[PDB]
Amino acid sequence: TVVGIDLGTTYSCVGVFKNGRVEIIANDQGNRITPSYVAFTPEGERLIGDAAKNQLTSNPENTVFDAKRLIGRTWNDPSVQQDIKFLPFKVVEKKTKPYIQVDIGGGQTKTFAPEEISAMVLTKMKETAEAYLGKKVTHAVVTVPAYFNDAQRQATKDAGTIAGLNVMRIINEPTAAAIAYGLDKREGEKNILVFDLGGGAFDVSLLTIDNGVFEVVATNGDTHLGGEDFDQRVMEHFIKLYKKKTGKDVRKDNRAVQKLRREVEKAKRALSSQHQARIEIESFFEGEDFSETLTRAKFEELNMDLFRSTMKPVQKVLEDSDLKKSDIDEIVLVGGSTRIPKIQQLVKEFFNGKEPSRGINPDEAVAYGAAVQAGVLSGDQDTGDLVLLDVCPLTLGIETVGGVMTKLIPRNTVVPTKKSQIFSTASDNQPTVTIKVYEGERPLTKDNHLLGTFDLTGIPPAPRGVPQIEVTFEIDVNGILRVTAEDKGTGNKNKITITNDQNRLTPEEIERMVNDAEKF
Numbered sequence: 001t002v003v004g005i006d007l008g009t010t011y012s013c014v015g016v017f018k019n020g021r022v023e024i025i026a027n028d029q030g031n032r033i034t035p036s037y038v039a040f041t042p043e044g045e046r047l048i049g050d051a052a053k054n055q056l057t058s059n060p061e062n063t064v065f066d067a068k069r070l071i072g073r074t075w076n077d078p079s080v081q082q083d084i085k086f087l088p089f090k091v092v093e094k095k096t097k098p099y100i101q102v103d104i105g106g107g108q109t110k111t112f113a114p115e116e117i118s119a120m121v122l123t124k125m126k127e128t129a130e131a132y133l134g135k136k137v138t139h140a141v142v143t144v145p146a147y148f149n150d151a152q153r154q155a156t157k158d159a160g161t162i163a164g165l166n167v168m169r170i171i172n173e174p175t176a177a178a179i180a181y182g183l184d185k186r187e188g189e190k191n192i193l194v195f196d197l198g199g200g201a202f203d204v205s206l207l208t209i210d211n212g213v214f215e216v217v218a219t220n221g222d223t224h225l226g227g228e229d230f231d232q233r234v235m236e237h238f239i240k241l242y243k244k245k246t247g248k249d250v251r252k253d254n255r256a257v258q259k260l261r262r263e264v265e266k267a268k269r270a271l272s273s274q275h276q277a278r279i280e281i282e283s284f285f286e287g288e289d290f291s292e293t294l295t296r297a298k299f300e301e302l303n304m305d306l307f308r309s310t311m312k313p314v315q316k317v318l319e320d321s322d323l324k325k326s327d328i329d330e331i332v333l334v335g336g337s338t339r340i341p342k343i344q345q346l347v348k349e350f351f352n353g354k355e356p357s358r359g360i361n362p363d364e365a366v367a368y369g370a371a372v373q374a375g376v377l378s379g380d381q382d383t384g385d386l387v388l389l390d391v392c393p394l395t396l397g398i399e400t401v402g403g404v405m406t407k408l409i410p411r412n413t414v415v416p417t418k419k420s421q422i423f424s425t426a427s428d429n430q431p432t433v434t435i436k437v438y439e440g441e442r443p444l445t446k447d448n449h450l451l452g453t454f455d456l457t458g459i460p461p462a463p464r465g466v467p468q469i470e471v472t473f474e475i476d477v478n479g480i481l482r483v484t485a486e487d488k489g490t491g492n493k494n495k496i497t498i499t500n501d502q503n504r505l506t507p508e509e510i511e512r513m514v515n516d517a518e519k520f
């Protein structure tokens with residue numbers, strides 16, 4: 001049995017399709033969602049989920065969360081460096097990547113890739129399913145944000161592999177939510193706008209849905225905008241307010257900062273139905289108390305630029321799809337941050353008063369869709385006929401003379417897809433040709449994201465411009481790039497091997513990580 005797993009920034013959820021419906025599976029504490037948290041106690045045990053989250057404020061330095069905000073990123077990514085200020089665990093550079101360093105008891109230290117932390121969360125979700133089903137789970141569909149880049153997708157797949165899962169399919173969050181919405185609808189072709197604002201990432205997708213055929217027409221998002229940022233804006237407001245009023249800087253006392261996080265999260269949720277919320281921390285800093293009242297007005301003001309920025313991807317999607325606001329037949333709100341009244345108001349006002357679709361739990365819609373997809377890919381016959389056409393989120397291009405982004409595969413192209421191009425040499429007997437591939441929509445590569453540098457190696461001695469090497473760029477159904485090369489010269493064909501600077505986790509490295517995880 002293939003399971004569907006929503007691997008979320010703040011929570012994870014696992015479901016299965018059985019006897020013609022989705023079951024969202026409860027964990028050992030009876031909760032249908034599990035916090036995406038891992039902790040290491042001084043006594044040496046590894047805690048996952050609710051038990052890990054519950055000791056955050058007493059053991060903050062060795063409690064890990066928000067790994068999805070770091071996964072597949074490089075060390076000098078501004079979103080990594082900005083998030084470090086709010087995370088209690090040490091983040092250290094290794095392999096040009098942010099690794100997580102913790103104490104595991106007995107004066108001992110261990111360093112983990114974000115992939116490894118997410119693999120521990122996936123392992124717990126797998127075990128939750130295995131307890132319910134009474135048998136081993138080896139295959140899964142796993143969710144990612146629609147706007148995840150190549151590295152973020154591959155790193156999520158690698159987390160699955162470390163957790164002992166054959167990840168059959170990576171599914172984009174809004175597409176999963178669309179399946180939850182539109183499964184078994186036999187209505188005419190409808191244009192559906194999915195507005196997906198979770199704990200860490202924001203996606204907008206426009207889909208056509210017509211009797212089981214789902215097509216993503218356009219997508220745009222922000223992989224570092226979500227509920228965690230709304231908490232962190234309020235946290236920073238109070239850290240600064242405390243220093244102004246007392247002269248004391250609490251930003252290094254991890255217990256203080258994470259007690260503030262706990263209280264802000266509680267207040268934020270309260271402010272979705274109340275207009276005021278009391279923040280109370282007994283023993284905030286140096287044994288002294290902290291009491292403040294947060295109004296809905298103040299919460300909104302502190303975050304208004306972030307809230308208003310969610311309209312930017314909405315307009316980008318309408319422009320790419322060539323649709324007007326009035327062509328949108330349904331608005332599907334998904335992600336727990338869509339519970340914020342101001343977000344609902346901004347979306348409603350953008351679409352001139354149109355109400356969102358009812359009957360959809362924004363916290364569970366993504367997991368529901370992943371479970372359906374898992375059932376379909378298994379070969380189940382009690383699901384509806386599901387046909388999915390999804391897209392690549394980012395234009396792929398190659399750097400050419402003058403730092404120019406020369407487009408190869410445009411954004412919003414249905415995957416899988418491929419493009420080929422012939423390369424040659426600039427100098428006599430040149431043995432290697434380098435190709436830099438970028439992701440993004442700006443005309444200069446310095447303003448886009450480097451996907452990787454690829455070296456065509458083993459080019460046999462020849463005069464300049466004579467070699468003819470056909471390089472193929474294929475984006476698979478998961479949204480991940482593979483680059484291959486073939487010699488198209490006349491006479492003796494030579495093997496052209498490609499090397500890259502992506503620093504993929506190798507099977508050797510994954511095996512080591514599997515063995516390291518079993519020690520807990």
Ligand SMILES: Nc1ncnc2c1ncn2[C@@H]1O[C@H](COP(=O)(O)OP(=O)(O)O)[C@@H](O)[C@H]1O
Nearest residue numbers: 008009010011198199227269272335336337339
């Ligand atoms: N009533 C609420 N008001 C405001 N924010 C909420 C509410 N309920 C949940 N959230 C936020 O939703 C985010 C989590 O969204 P969810 O979709 O459940 O999980 P994930 O994004 O981790 O997959 C968190 O940032 C949480 O604070």
